[PDB]
């Protein structure tokens, strides 16, 4: 699995469909239409393709300043 952040159209995205492609939801943002999901690296295409999915961001490293 890899961790990704999905921008979604809440009016069309079905979060229950995530489980089918082998992923699970880690955190659903309350203040922006996005969800962090763990998904096998190879279902990323299936994810990008799911209805209401608008953008798929990889998680990136942050570093202390």
């Amino acid at each position: 699995t890899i961790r990704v952040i999905v921008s979604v159209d809440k009016a069309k995205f079905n979060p229950h469909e995530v489980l089918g492609i082998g992923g699970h939801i880690v955190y659903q943002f309350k203040l922006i239409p996005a969800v962090v999901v763990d998904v096998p690296a190879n279902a990323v295409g299936k994810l990008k393709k799911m209805p209401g999915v608008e953008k798929v961001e990889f998680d990136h490293q942050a570093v202390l300043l």
């Binding site: 955190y27 943002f29 309350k30 922006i32 962090v36 998680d59 570093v63 202390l64």
Partner: protein, 318 residues
Amino acid sequence: QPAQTIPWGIERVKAPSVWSITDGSVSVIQVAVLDTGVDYDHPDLAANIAWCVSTLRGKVSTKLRDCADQNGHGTHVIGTIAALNNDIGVVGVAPGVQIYSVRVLDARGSGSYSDIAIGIEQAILGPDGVADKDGDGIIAGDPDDDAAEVISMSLGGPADDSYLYDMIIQAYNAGIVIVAASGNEGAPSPSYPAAYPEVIAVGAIDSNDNIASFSNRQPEVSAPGVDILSTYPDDSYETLMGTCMATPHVSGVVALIQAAYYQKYGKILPVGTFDDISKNTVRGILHITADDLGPTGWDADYGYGVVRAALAVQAALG
């Protein structure tokens, strides 16, 4: 525990004379520090720690083993903002202000973007998990919500135009003042998130008002960032340098402005813009009351100048 001393940077930003008006202990005011965590039981911090949380690995946790500082950076930054005015240690810019310690970075100061975004959301939601409980659109400065009024960010990176920046924008829109270090490379401009227009970029001065050679240029304001004594684990004290030590002086100054304004008027000031030269916003007041060092006006070294709580508060209340 050593007898209390006042670190030079606390006097330079003209904090102690404000404390007869407010030490920041107005109940609606919280400062969220997104960093390596806190030494939550430090005797010079504990009473001001309102919430100790971690968003590491995308899990919101208040377990002590998750939220406790393993690096020391968060503890030091929190100390500069809010170390208690008492018989020991040091004293913060706003030694009575409530702190949310939001750990978004591990022992080595590493973290992920997702955890940082969740940390910003947590600062807005507060401990009740709801941004705007009474639905009036007032989040920061609303005594019926528990949102932070200031977010102090100890991160540096390249530009982001993703959900993370979106989350910074949500915080700004909630009326929250966001502060971040310009960076420590002596580079010609600020790192992100300091570089965003929603965020105050802070540069570092030494005790002779010289801009530090490591301070990234083009900040918005500047503050003490060399030889800064503050709290450090475990129940200890450490001297550090960085634009990241300058940042909490500015966060503390903002906390004093909002606490004194709310204490007087029952509301807070709008955040304002990088451009602002009015008395009608936090950033306006910070800019016009700053000590204008270097060339007249905003310059690439000092920004608007060195922040000054005494003058800022006087402006806000007059």
